[PDB]
C-alpha cells in the first residue's frame, strides 16, 4: 500500500507484517523545501543518511514484529531547504500478523503441479463415517462425528495484534459465489461458509489468537469445475461509523479438490467381489479359493439383493481419492441402474468408502456405460511424457452412426476432468456387449515395465489348432466335457470358410487397438502376449466369444482366475489352457481355470464380468505428476 | 498398421502414403526355416540383404507413389532353413494418397499456440452477410450468399487411387457428437456435418480427386467449449458384404475457434456512437467536431429508437474475431436490455459485423452488467509474462454480502473463456453506478509505454483548491457557468469537514485499485497520471461525483472528449481545466471540455458513458499469443 504523509497533520495506519508499504513524501510536502530525512522507531526497518525531494526515488517500510498498542511505532519525515527551518509530517503504524495458513507443502498464493509445486489438497467427503444415515457426509450442513473431521482439510487463522484493535477492524472469511456450491468450512465446530453463506465475519480478539477452520468440498472437478477452491480473509477498517468499511487487506490460499483415481490389475488386491446365485456355488469356491490364496477379504451379495443380477464387474468401480492426511476408496457407481442399483448405494459407501455418481439415472444409456468397459493401464511413460498412474482406457465406435454406440458423454467428461490418468478412448463397439474387458487384460511381470498386456487372438489359436491337426490330433474334440452341447473337431473347425471369416474380421478390429495401445500406451511388441480365442459374429454382425474367453480373467496378483476354455484334449490335457500356461507361468503366474460355462458363458460372460476388486493404491502422490 | 504374411496364402492390403506400414514374418513362418530374403517391386522401399528369422528385428514399408492399379505393387517373402528349398509368401499392396488439409501454418495433427505452433483456425460465423434476414449466418443449414463463404474456414480431401477403388472402400467424414452442435461444414454447396449430422459417406470417385470444404463454428469458447473442433476422415474397407466394414485409417485435422477480443483506448478510433436526444443538441455536435477531427464515421440512435435512453456506451462493446483470411468487428450486447435494447441486434449487427451475447435476458442482473464496467488495458508485460492484446478490467466489490454487486457469472465466465485478454476483476461497487469507467481511462503516450493510465484523485483537487485559495482566490466559485445552481466558494469547500471525509474514503477505494492494477498490469508510478476529480457519497453511502468526471472522457486518439467540470474561474479560464491541459498536453493530447451538465452529469454519467468507439484491431495475431 501507499501511505500519503502529511506536515498538515499526523498519519493513522495499519501495517500486515509480510506486506511492502510505502510512502508518498512529495505530493503534499510544503514548500521553500528541497531535502528530507526519515527517522523511525526501532521496530521500523526504512529503504530507500539525508535525501533531495526527487519523486522517482523510493522509500519503504518494514515492521519486524506485531505492535503491542495502537499507533506504538512511529515514522518521522523532516522537510528542509536552505533558507528554511525543518517541518516534520507525523506518521503512527500499527503492525499486525495477519496468517491465514494450509498445508501448501503438502506434508500434513497459487496452485502449481509437481514434486517442486505448492497449492494445499481437499477431498470430496463423500464417504458416511456417520453410522445412522442414508446420505454422504457432505450434503447437511454439520459435523456429526469427530471421526468425520480425519477427511477434511484443515486451515488455521493466526493474528498478533493489539488488545483492543477489534474495536476499529473486523475480519471476514468468504469465497467466490462461483465456488460457494462446492466448498463448506467449519469453525472449531459450526458452519461458516458453505453454498448458502459466501461470507462470514470472523469474531476475533486481540492480543495472540488461532482459529482452526476444517474444510470440506461438494464436488469433484468436471466439465464445470476445473477443482480450484480459492478461501480469502479480508480486514475491514471500520473506524468511522458514518462511512462504509474499506479494504486495507486480503490474503488467500487454494485448495485443489482430489481427482478420483482407478486401480489397475498390477496393483495389490484387497478385497473380490462376487453374486450369489441359483447355480453358482462351484463357480464361487473357486474364486473364494483364490480370494483365500491372495488374501483378500470376500464379498458377497445374495440374491435377495441380486434381484438376477450376476454381473458385479458392471455396475462399479473401485477407485480412490488421496491427500496427505487421508486416503480412502470411492466407488464410481455406474448409471447402468440394472439389479445390482442398491449395492453400491447400501453395503459399499461407508465410513472410510466414498460414493460418486454420473449420467442419467432413468433411461438414456448403453452397454458401453457399464464398467466392463472402463479399465486403467498401469504407469507408463510415452515418449518421454510420464503417465505415474497409468492411463484410463475405455470403449468407444471408431465413428458416431446411427448403429453406433458409446459412453455416456457425461461420463467420458468426468474422467477427463479427473486428468492424471488421461483417458484413451478403444474401438470395442464391434462386441456384442461391447466391453475393453472381453479383448484386453494386464497382468504383473517380474520384468521389462512389470506387466505385460493380454490380447484376445484368433491367429493364436488357428495356429495352435493348426500344430495339433499336424501331429495327429485333427479329431480332438473341442467341448470335451460338455455334454449337453456338440462336440467339433479340430479338422471340421478348421475348414470352416465362414468362422475363419468371422475371425479375420474380428483379427481386424482387435489389431487395430494393438496399434492403437501401442501408440497411446509406448508399448512395444516384447510388453504384448497374445492368448488363443475364437469368437463368432452373431446378430447384426457383432462379435462373441465362440468358447470362454480366457483374456476375461481375474487378476489377483500372481493368482489369476482364467475361464475354462474347455479346449480339446490331448496328453490329458485341454491344449487351449497348456497354451496359457506356457506363456504365463513363465512370468510367475498362476492359471486357475474356473468353470463358468452354464453359470456365465452362456449368459455372455465370463469371470472378470461376474466379480470387481478394491485394489492398493499408488504410493505415488497424484499432485506430484505434471499432467 | 501391421500385416501378417502367409505361405498358406497370397495376402491383399491397402496403405496409405505417409503411414508407417510393417510386417509380421514370424508367427504364420512354415517350419524347416531358419532365414528370409524380401524382394519387392520399385514402388516398394523395404528397411530393416538375408537375414534370421527373429521375431524382434523389425520391417517396414513406405511406399513412393500412388498405386494405379489395385495391388499393383508386390511384395515376396523368401523363408529358406539349411536342408530346406525356399518357401514363398506373397503380398499384394495398394497405395493411396488420403489428405485431408487445412491452413494449419495460420497463412491463408494437435492444436498449440505461438509463433511456431500449428492448428487451423476458424470463425464463429455470428454476422449477417444475408441482406434479408434478422438471424445469424450461422442459425440456419445452408449457405444463402457467396460472400458468406469469405467467413468459413477452408479444408481440402486430396485423393489419390486406382481407378476402382471405391468398389472395395469408402471414405467418412465425422466429428464427435460431443462437439456437432458447435460446427457445421458445407460440400463444395450443400451441408453435410452439423448438430443435425455428425458423420458422412463421401461420394468419392478414383483416380485424382480433391474435395473443398468450408466450415463455421457456432459458439465461441465458454465455460463448457474449450474452443477446439476435431474433424475427422476415415477410409473404411467394405469388401464383404456380409461383414461390417472395418476401419483401416482415420486422419485428423484441428480448428480453433477464434476468442472475442475487445479494442482499448490506444487503438485508433474507426466509429463512434452516441444518442440524439430532446435538449442534447449542444453535445453532439462537441461530439461530431471530434469524431470528424479524427476521421471517424459517426452513429447516432435517434430518440424513436432510443426510447429515453441516453447510455451508449452501456448496452454494447465493439470487440472483433480474427482469422488468417478475415478479420471483423462483433458486438458484445450486454444483458442489461433497456431502452437501447435492440440498436445491437437492428443497427450495428450486420455484414461483416458479427453479435455475441450472455447472460439471463429477462431479469436477474445489475449495474455491474453494464459496459460502462468492462475496459481493456493496452499491451502489457507483467514480470517477463506478454499481454500483446491488454488484459480486461471490470468492476467486482471486495468481498460478497447481502449489500454487494457482481457482474454476472455467466459474463466473467465468457471472458475468461476467451483466455487472451486475461481479465482481471477490479473494485468498483464503492461507486453508485459502479463503473471502472468513473475513475480510470487509458491515453496514447508518445513514450514510456505508449499510455498513460487515468485516475480519478480527490487527493489533486484539494490540493490545487489549497494552492489557490494561498495565491489569493480562496473566493473563487466552483460552478461559475452554472446559473440554476448554487455556487461555492474554493475557501468553504477546503474548510468542509464531511465532505473532506467523503473524499478520504474515497481516495481508500482508488488507491487500493491504483496498487491492483500496479500488480495485474505491471506498471510504475510514472505511468500514472491523477486527475483532480471530487466525489461525494449519497443513498446507502456510495459515490457520486461533485462536479462532472473529467476522467470519464472519450479517446478519439490524440482528441479527447473531456466533461467541462465547471471549475472556478481565475485567470480568464477554469483551473481544473488548466490543471489537465497542463498534465494532458505534454503529451500530445488534445483537450475539448463538453458540456454535458444537465444533459448527462445530473442523470449521473459524463461523455465517455454517452458514447461508444469501434476500433482498429491489433496486427498482432491472438493465435502467437503464448497464455
Ligand atoms: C463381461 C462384462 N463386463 N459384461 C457382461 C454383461 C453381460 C450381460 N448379459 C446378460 O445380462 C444376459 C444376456 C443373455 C442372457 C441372459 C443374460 C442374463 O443376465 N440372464 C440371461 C449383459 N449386460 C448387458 C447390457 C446391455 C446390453 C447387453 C447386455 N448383456
Ligand atoms: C458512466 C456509465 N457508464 N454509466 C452511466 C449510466 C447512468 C444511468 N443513469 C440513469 O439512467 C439515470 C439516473 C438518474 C436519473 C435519470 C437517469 C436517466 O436515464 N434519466 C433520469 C444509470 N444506469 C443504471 C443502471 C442501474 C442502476 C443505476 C443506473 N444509473
Ligand atoms: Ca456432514
Ligand atoms: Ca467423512
Ligand atoms: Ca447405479
Ligand atoms: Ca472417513
Ligand atoms: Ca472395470
Ligand atoms: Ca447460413
Ligand atoms: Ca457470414
Ligand atoms: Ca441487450
Ligand atoms: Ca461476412
Ligand atoms: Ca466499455
Redesign the interface.
Known amino acids: ?2 501511505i ?1 504523509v502529511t506536515p498538515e497533520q499526523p498519519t493513522h495506519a495499519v501495517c500486515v507484517l509480510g506486506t511492502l508499504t510505502q510512502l508518498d513524501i512529495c ?2 510536502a510544503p514548500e521553500d523545501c528541497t531535502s528530507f530525512s526519515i527517522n523511525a522507531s526501532p521496530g521500523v526497518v526504512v529503504d530507500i543518511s539525508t535525501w533531495p525531494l526527487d ?2 526515488v523510493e522509500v519503504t517500510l518494514t515492521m519486524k514484529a506485531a505492535s503491542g498498542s495502537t499507533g506504538d511505532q512511529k515514522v518521522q519525515i523532516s522537510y528542509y531547504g536552505p533558507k528554511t527551518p525543518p517541518v516534520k509530517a507525523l506518521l503512527y503504524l500499527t503492525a499486525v500478523e495477519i496468517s491465514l495458513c494450509a498445508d501448501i507443502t503438502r506434508t500434513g498464493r497459487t496452485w502449481t503441479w509437481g514434486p517442486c509445486g505448492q497449492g494445499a489438497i481437499l477431498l470430496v467427503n463423500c464417504d458416511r463415517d456417520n453410522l445412522e444415515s442414508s446420505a454422504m457426509d457432505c450434503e447437511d450442513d454439520e459435523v456429526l462425528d469427530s471421526e468425520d473431521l480425519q477427511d477434511m482439510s484443515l486451515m488455521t487463522l493466526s493474528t498478533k495484534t493489539p488488545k483492543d484493535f477489534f474495536t476499529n477492524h473486523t475480519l ?1 472469511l ?1 469465497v ?3 465456488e460457494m456450491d462446492k466448498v463448506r468450512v467449519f469453525q472449531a465446530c459450526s458452519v461458516v461458509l458453505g453454498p448458502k453463506w ?2 462470514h465475519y470472523l469474531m476475533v480478539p486481540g492480543g495472540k489468537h488461532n482459529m482452526d477452520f476444517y474444510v470440506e468440498a461438494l464436488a469433484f472437478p468436471d ?2 469445475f476445473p477443482g480450484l477452491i480459492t478461501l ?1 480473509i ?1 480486514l475491514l ?1 471500520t473506524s ?1 461509523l ?3 468499511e ?2 486495507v487487506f ?1 490474503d488467500s490460499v487454494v485448495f485443489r479438490v482430489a481427482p478420483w483415481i482407478m486401480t489397475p490389475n498390477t496393483q495389490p488386491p484387497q478385497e473380490v467381489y462376487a453374486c450369489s446365485i441359483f447355480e453358482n456355488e462351484d463357480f464361487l469356491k473357486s474364486v473364494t479359493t483364490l480370494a483365500m490364496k491372495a488374501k483378500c477379504k470376500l464379498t458377497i451379495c445374495p440374491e435377495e439383493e441380486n434381484m438376477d443380477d450376476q454381473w458385479m464387474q458392471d455396475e462399479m468401480e473401485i477407485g480412490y481419492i488421496q491427500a496427505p492426511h487421508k486416503t480412502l476408496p470411492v466407488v464410481f457407481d455406474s448409471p447402468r441402474n440394472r439389479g445390482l442399483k442398491e449395492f453400491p448405494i447400501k453395503r459399499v459407501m461407508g465410513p472410510d468408502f466414498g460414493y460418486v455418481t454420473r449420467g442419467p439415472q432413468t433411461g438414456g444409456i448403453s452397454g458401453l456405460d457399464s464398467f466392463g468397459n472402463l479399465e486403467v493401464s498401469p504407469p507408463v511413460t510415452v515418449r518421454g511424457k510420464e503417465y505415474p498412474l497409468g492411463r484410463i482406457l475405455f470403449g468407444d465406435s ?4 446411427n448403429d453406433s454406440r ?1 459412453m455416456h ?1 457425461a461420463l ?1 467428461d468426468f474422467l477427463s476432468a479427473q486428468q492424471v490418468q488421461a483417458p484413451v478412448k478403444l ?1 470395442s463397439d ?1 462386441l456384442s456387449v461391447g466391453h475393453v474387458d472381453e479383448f484386453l487384460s494386464f497382468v504383473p511381470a517380474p520384468d521389462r515395465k512389470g506387466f505385460r498386456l493380454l490380447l484376445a487372438s484368433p ?1 493364436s489359436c488357428y ?1 495352435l489348432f493348426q500344430e495339433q491337426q499336424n501331429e495327429g490330433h485333427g479329431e480332438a474334440l473341442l467341448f470335451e466335457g460338455i455334454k449337453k452341447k456338440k462336440q467339433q473337431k479340430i479338422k471340421n473347425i478348421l475348414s470352416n470358410k465362414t468362422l475363419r ?2 475371425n479375420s ?1 474380428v483379427e ?2 482387435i ?2 487397438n ?2 492403437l495401445l501401442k501408440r497411446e500406451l509406448g508399448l512395444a ?2 510388453d504384448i502376449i497374445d492368448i488363443p480365442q475364437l469368437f463368432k ?1 452373431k446378430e447384426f ?1 457383432k462379435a462373441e466369444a465362440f468358447f470362454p474367453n480366457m483374456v476375461n480373467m481375474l487378476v489377483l496378483g500372481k493368482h489369476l482366475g482364467i475361464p475354462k476354455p474347455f479346449g480339446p484334449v490331448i496328453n490329458g490335457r485341454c491344449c487351449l489352457e497348456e497354451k496359457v500356461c506356457s506363456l504365463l507361468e513363465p512370468l510367475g503366474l498362476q492359471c486357475t481355470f474356473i468353470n463358468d460355462f452354464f453359470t456365465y458363458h452362456i449368459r455372455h460372460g465370463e469371470v472378470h464380468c461376474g466379480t470387481n476388486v478394491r485394489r492398493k493404491p499408488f504410493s505415488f502422490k497424484w499432485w506430484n505428476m505434471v499432467p
Chains 1, 2 share one sequence.
Not at 398 to 401: A, E, F, G, I, R
Open positions: 500500500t501507499l500519503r505530493s503534499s519523486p522517482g471476514v468468504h467466490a459465489r462461483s459466501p461470507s466439465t464445470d480469502t479480508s477498517d468511522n458514518e462511512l462504509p474499506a479494504v486480503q471408431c465413428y458416431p452412426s458409446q458423454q467420458q474401438y464391434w491367429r495356429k471369416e468371422h474380421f481386424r478390429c489389431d487395430w494393438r496399434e511388441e516384447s459374429l454382425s
